[PDB]
Design a protein around this nucleic acid. Structure first.
Length: 108
DNA sequence: CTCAAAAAACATAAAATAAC
DNA sequence: GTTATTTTATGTTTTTTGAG
């Protein structure tokens, strides 16, 4: 299933692709961690998603063992791919001590 | 009963690691 | 000998703590 984010990007969590509606040729290939983060965020729009939840969805439920630092690094890479600025975000907002929150519109 | 300083939490820049 | 993923080093922001 595809998601349209902030009426700007088309995200496909199955192919792991991000496409900016300004482009006819460019397909952004998201890394696995960035895609899975964006998928869980888009399935729960505007919810504060805990770090544990993202850690579990993205790594643990698939047997992968990584430090919490991997979440924070993957968020930073994703924000870069979305051209999302850390304050003031348009896509992913940090909620300190509680996780992250997708504030972009999600249309499915 | 506040607000500075200390500690914790999060972000980005580099490096390390692993496996094509 | 190159690239994805993870981790480490350094930087920035937020929160907790407690003395005045």
């Amino acid at each position: 299933m595809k998601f349209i984010l902030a009426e700007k990007f088309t995200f496909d969590p199955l192919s792991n692709t991000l496409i900016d509606k300004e482009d006819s040729e460019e397909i952004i290939r998201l890394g696995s961690n960035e895609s899975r983060i964006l998928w869980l965020l888009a399935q729960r729009p505007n919810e504060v998603i805990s770090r544990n939840d993202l850690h579990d969805f993205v790594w643990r439920e698939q047997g992968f063992e990584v430090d919490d630092s991997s979440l924070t690094q993957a968020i930073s890479t994703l924000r870069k791919m979305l051209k999302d600025s850390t304050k003031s975000p348009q896509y992913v907002k940090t909620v300190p001590k509680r996780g992250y929150q997708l504030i972009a519109r999600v249309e499915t």
